Amino acid sequence: HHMNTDERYKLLRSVGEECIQESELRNLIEKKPLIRCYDGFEPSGRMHIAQGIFKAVNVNKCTAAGCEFVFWVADWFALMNDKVGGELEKIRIVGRYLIEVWKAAGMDMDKVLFLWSSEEITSHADTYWRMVLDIGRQNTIARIKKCCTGTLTAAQVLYPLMQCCDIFFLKADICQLGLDQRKVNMLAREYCDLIGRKLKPVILSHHMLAGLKQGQAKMSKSDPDSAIFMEDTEEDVARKIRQAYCPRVKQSASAITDDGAPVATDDRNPVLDYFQCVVYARPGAAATIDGTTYATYEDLEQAFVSDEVSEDALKSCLIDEVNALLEPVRQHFASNEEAHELLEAVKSYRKDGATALPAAPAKPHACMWMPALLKVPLDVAEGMIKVTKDFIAAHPEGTVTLVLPDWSAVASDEITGVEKDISAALQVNCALLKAYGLPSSVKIVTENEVILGNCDDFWVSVIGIARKNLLSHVEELYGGEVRNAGQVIAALMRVATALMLSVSHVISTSLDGHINAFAREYTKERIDCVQTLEGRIPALHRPGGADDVLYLDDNDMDIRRKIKKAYSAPNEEANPVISVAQHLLAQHGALSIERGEANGGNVSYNTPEALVADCGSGALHPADLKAAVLQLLLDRSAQARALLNGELKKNMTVLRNAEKKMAKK
Ligand SMILES: O=c1c(O)c(-c2ccc(O)c(O)c2)oc2cc(O)ccc12
Numbered sequence: 290h291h292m293n294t295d296e297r298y299k300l301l302r303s304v305g306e307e308c309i310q311e312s313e314l315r316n317l318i319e320k321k322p323l324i325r326c327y328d329g330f331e332p333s334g335r336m337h338i339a340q341g342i343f344k345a346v347n348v349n350k351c352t353a354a355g356c357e358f359v360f361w362v363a364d365w366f367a368l369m370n371d372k373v374g375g376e377l378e379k380i381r382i383v384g385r386y387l388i389e390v391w392k393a394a395g396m397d398m399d400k401v402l403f404l405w406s407s408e409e410i411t412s413h414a415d416t417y418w419r420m421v422l423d424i425g426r427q428n429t430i431a432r433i434k435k436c437c438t439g440t441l442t443a444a445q446v447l448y449p450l451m452q453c454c455d456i457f458f459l460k461a462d463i464c465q466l467g468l469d470q471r472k473v474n475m476l477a478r479e480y481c482d483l484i485g486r487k488l489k490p491v492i493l494s495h496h497m498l499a500g501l502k503q504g505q506a507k508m509s510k511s512d513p514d515s516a517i518f519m520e521d522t523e524e525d526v527a528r529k530i531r532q533a534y535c536p537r538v539k540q541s542a543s544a545i546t547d548d549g550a551p552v553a554t555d556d557r558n559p560v561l562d563y564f565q566c567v568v569y570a571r572p573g574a575a576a577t578i579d580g581t582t583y584a585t586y587e588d589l590e591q592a593f594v595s596d597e598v599s600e601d602a603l604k605s606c607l608i609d610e611v612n613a614l615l616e617p618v619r620q621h622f623a624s625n626e627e628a629h630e631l632l633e634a635v636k637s638y639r640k641d642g643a644t645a646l647p648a649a650p651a652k653p654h655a656c657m658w659m660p661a662l663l664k665v666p667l668d669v670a671e672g673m674i675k676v677t678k679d680f681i682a683a684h685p686e687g688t689v690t691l692v693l694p695d696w697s698a699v700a701s702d703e704i705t706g707v708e709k710d711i712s713a714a715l716q717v718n719c720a721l722l723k724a725y726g727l728p729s730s731v732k733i734v735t736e737n738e739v740i741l742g743n744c745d746d747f748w749v750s751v752i753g754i755a756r757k758n759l760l761s762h763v764e765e766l767y768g769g770e771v772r773n774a775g776q777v778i779a780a781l782m783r784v785a786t787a788l789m790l791s792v793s794h795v796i797s798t799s800l801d802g803h804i805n806a807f808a809r810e811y812t813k814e815r816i817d818c819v820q821t822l823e824g825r826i827p828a829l830h831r832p833g834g835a836d837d838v839l840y841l842d843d844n845d846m847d848i849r850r851k852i853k854k855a856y857s858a859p860n861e862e863a864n865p866v867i868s869v870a871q872h873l874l875a876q877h878g879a880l881s882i883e884r885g886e887a888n889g890g891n892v893s894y895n896t897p898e899a900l901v902a903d904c905g906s907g908a909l910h911p912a913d914l915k916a917a918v919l920q921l922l923l924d925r926s927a928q929a930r931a932l933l934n935g936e937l938k939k940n941m942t943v944l945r946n947a948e949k950k951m952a953k954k
Contacts, residue, residue, distance in 0.1 A: 292354070294319055301354040301493070303570075304347045306468055307545055309478070309492035317462060317491060318354070323400075326351045326493070327461035329361035329452070332383035334635050336390060337508050338517040339498040342567050342614050345396040347495055351465060352400045353572075358465075361455050365406035368749050369756075370644070377407065379638055386631045390519055393621040393628075394614070404459070413458075414744045419708075420454045422700040425774035427483050428476070433774045434760075436472045438550075444755025444763075444781070446774055453477050456490055468494040469507075471549030497551045498566055499559035501533040506553035520632075522619075523612045530608045535560045535600050539590055560607055564589060568610055576610065578602045644753060649815065650791040653687030655680045657796035658783065658805070661698030661711055663948055664840040665718045667725075669798055672821035674726050676796055680819065681730055689731045690790055693719060696736040697782050700775035710947040713940045720937060721841045724929035739786060751778070751785045754811060766803045784808045787816060794819050825872050829865045831856035842941075844933050845923060852919045862905025866915055871897045873921050882909070882917040889913070 292300070298318050302308055317324055328344070348358050367380040388403060410417050425433070434442060436449035456464055456477045464474045474492040481489045497507055500515040508516040514529045521529070538556040546552070568574050569586040576582070576589050578598050583589040592598045598606075622628045657673065677689050693715040695708070704710055719733060740747050763780050764771055771777055787795055787808040797805040798821040808816050829837045829851060839851060857866040874880035874894060881893045889908045894900040903909035933941060 297354045300350055301356070304350050304465060304495055305493040306496040306542070307471075307492070307494045309474075309494075310489070313489065313491050314463070314493065321462065322355070324351075324354075324356040325460055325462040326356045326358045326465040327361060327456065327459055327463065328358075328466050329363055329455060330387075331363045331366055332380050332387055334383045334386070334638065336387060336519045338519070338563075338567060338611070338614075339508060340387075341390060341394055341519045341618070343495070343498060343570075345391055345394045346567070346570050347465065348401060349395070349397050349572075351463075352397055356400070356463070358401045359459055359461070360401065360403045361459060362403055362405045365410050368407070368745060369753065371749075381405070381407075382631065382634050383638070386635045389621075389628055389631055390618055393618045394519075395617065409458075411745050414741060417454065417458055418740075418744075418748065419696075419699075420457060421450045422696065422775060422778060423484075424453050424476075424480055425450045425778055426700050426702050426706055427480070428774050430760075430764075430771050430774045430777065432476070436476055440759070440761050442760045443758060444752065444760065444777070446760060446777060447752060447755050449473050449476065450774065450778075453480060457484075457486070461490055462488075463491045463493050465493045465495065467549070468497055468551070469549040470494075472547070494549070496562075496566060499551075499557055499562040500553070501529055501559045503534040503555070504553050505534075505559075506551040506557065517611055517615075519615060519618055521615070523615075526612050526615065527608050530560065530604050530611065533560055533604065534558070535604065537594055537596075537600070539594055540565075560603055561590060561593070563607055563611070567614060568607075576606050578606045646812075647750075647788050647791070650793050653680075653684035653794065654790065654792045655684075655687065655689045655794040655796055655819065656787055656790055656792040657689065657691050657798075658697075658801060659691055659693045659715050659719055659722075660798060660800045661694055661701070661703035661715060662718070662800070662834070663704055663714055663944060663951070664834050664842055665722075666826075667839040667841050668823050668826040669800065669821070670722050670725055670841045671826065672798060672823045673722065673796070674728075676819060676821050677728055677731055680794070680796070681728060687793075689728070689796075690792070691719070691727075691731050691733050692739070692786060692790075693733070693735045694779075694783075696740055697779040700782070701779045702773050702775060705947050705950055707947075710943065713943045714947070717937050717940050717944060718841065720932055721929050724932055725841055725926070734790075736782070736786065739789065743789060747785060747789060750788060751781045754781050754784055758811070763807070766807055768803075780804055780807055784811050788812075792816060797821065799823050825868075827865055827868050829855035831864070839922075841929065842933065842944075843926070844930050848922055848926070849919065852915055852922070855915065857911040857915065859911050860905060861911075862901040866911065866918065867901065867904060870914060870918055871900060873918065874900065877921075880917065880921075882913055884913055 298315055301318065302311065302314060308314055351358050362384050364377065364380050364384055367377040370376045384405070392398060430446065433446050433449055437445045452473045453476050456474070464477065466474065471492070471494055474490070474494070478489045478492065498516070499506060500508055502512065502515055505512075505515050514532070517526055517529055536556050536558050538558065540558055540561050543551065564576060565586050568576055575584050578592075579602060583592060589598070593603055622632050657677070660669065680687065680689055695712050695715055698704070698711045698715070699706060699708055704714055760777070763777050766780055767776055783804060784807050794817050795805045795808050796819050806818060809818050826839060829839075837851065837854065839848070843851070855866050857864045870880055874897065879893050879895045880900065881891070883891055894903075900909070904914070
């Protein structure tokens with residue numbers, strides 16, 4: 290039986306209580322041969338009629354309209370509580386059990402597919418997780434808080450980033466999920482305008498079946514007779530519907546809450562709602578009471594409100610009708626040996642009703658994060674070098690790891706927020722940091738390497754940490770506020786990195802802020818915090834990322850300029866030029882200024898008191914000092930500037946291009 294475009298649209302559209310862009314659906318039906326419809330679930334085991342039958346009804350509607358239906362089985366979350374693949378294998382069995390019930394329940398599987406998050410995520414780690422982070426990177430945390438159900442949220446701002454990603458991961462054309470999941474699907478449509486993909490996913494949201502008792506807008510997990518379950522006997526079915534709330538009132542559609550979920554009112558009739566969803570929503574079904582048959586749902590609704598049909602009869606009718614729908618399942622799990630076993634295995638898990646901390650490191654291990662900056666201050670770089678040398682000496686059998694945060698920083702929206710730009714920045718500034726004297730003992734590892742190296746475990750701990758900490762708690766690390774949701778993730782990742790690298794100490798710079806203190810907090814004061822030593826090379830303007838502070842990517846021409854504009858009045862014993870000299874003096878052990886004889890003559894200083902004497906009250910002219918310092922900076926940066934014009938010249942093109950994009954906006 291061939292269906293024209295109009296008939297296909299009617300059938301498909303009839304799945305949704307709402308359809309975000311009927312025009313977009315219509316256009317999809319006209320243009321596209323295999324439309325991806327998508328839905329998803331975590332296996333629970335106790336399957337209720339809305340999930341058992343109603344889903345089957347709607348899926349069958351999509352596949353008849355010429356769609357393909359991909360179910361996203363969210364089993365990856367079993368890796369959370371896992372002890373040697375234990376919980377995962379159970380959840381996959383529950384998973385297979387649900388599928389078998391659907392088969393028996395009458396879902397046409399010819400164009401239906403089941404994907405398992407555990408298989409598909411881990412197999413496509415990069416593609417998957419980078420998007421998850423990108424959706425977070427480009428979204429205010431307020432916008433993502435809206436997607437979850439005062440502030441008790443605790444990294445439940447992560448699951449929506451994942452759920453949203455799934456839609457694009459699977460290339461879903463239609464998001465055929467419940468109306469309760471409306472808000473995430475919206476966020477999908479929004480994210481579509483961010484990633485340039487031209488066609489937004491059509492949100493075809495199905496009806497939330499009502500609870501059987503009064504004051505229930507939805508099925509309840511506390512109340513096992515709030516809805517019919519698939520394992521319920523025909524005696525159970527009779528009992529539950531007989532006691533069910535049943536107002537004699539003509540049912541009208543509820544107002545569309547932007548918060549997807551339904552609301553419980555007194556004139557909401559679940560006996561009638563069932564007839565509409567599990568009976569009349571089937572292709573050519575109709576109810577029969579006392580000889581007469583009602584072709585429309587409306588016909589039955591009238592006959593009930595006119596009192597042509599009794600509440601006794603109406604329920605008796607549903608009871609037989611619902612039992613008719615379950616019997617094929619009941620029969621199948623009796624006859625079929627393999628199916629019966631599936632159920633018996635699922636049943637056995639029910640007798641448990643009503644994670645360990647990672648091992649410390651044997652020997653010291655320091656960790657440090659390269660700042661995700663276009664231009665890194667020399668003051669900060671020298672602080673990092675000293676803290677490394679100070680750690681390696683103080684713990685000579687220990688190790689130091691510098692982590693280039695090429696995943697974290699893109700999540701945080703540092704620099705331009707582009708992978709290539711942040712990779713280049715981290716790669717360039719790292720090479721230069723080594724050119725200024727970073728020890729060779731330091732292990733340089735990227736997050737890309739660390740995360741992919743042991744990917745499954747990594748994200749488990751990111752979430753595991755996420756579950757144990759409140760959202761507001763993580764926002765305290767950024768001073769009470771985050772710029773986007775990605776900053777929340779970046780925080781979690783750093784602790785996750787610390788733990789996987791098995792680190793004893795976390796080195797923080799002034800740029801890292803309180804973010805690294807999280808690792809200390811989470812490990813119960815086990816990981817010690819070492820702070821960097823800064824405030825030695827100051828800004829070159831007079832007292833009162835600009836262009837009066839020395840960066841570690843300054844070339845020979847840049848250094849000459851910045852020194853030239855440095856503030857220094859004559860007969861002065863405290864100014865930027867003095868502070869830099871005393872630092873160079875201290876590091877070196879002497880500061881030799883060269884002069885014409887009778888211009889003062891040549892002189893050295895090996896103490897700060899001696900130098901300040903000749904400046905404030907003496908013959909050390911400002912100009913003489915600055916000519917001495919400028920040479921010393923050029924000499925100490927000879928190795929680094931050689932890299933700028935040679936090895937890093939390729940990447941320096943990418944950074945100056947990034948810099949101009951930032952100045953534009
Ligand atoms: O764990 C998931 C889940 O429970 C639901 C869901 C919840 C209520 C609904 O009414 C519905 O249609 C889907 O979606 C998902 C979509 C994903 O990409 C991943 C996981 C879930």
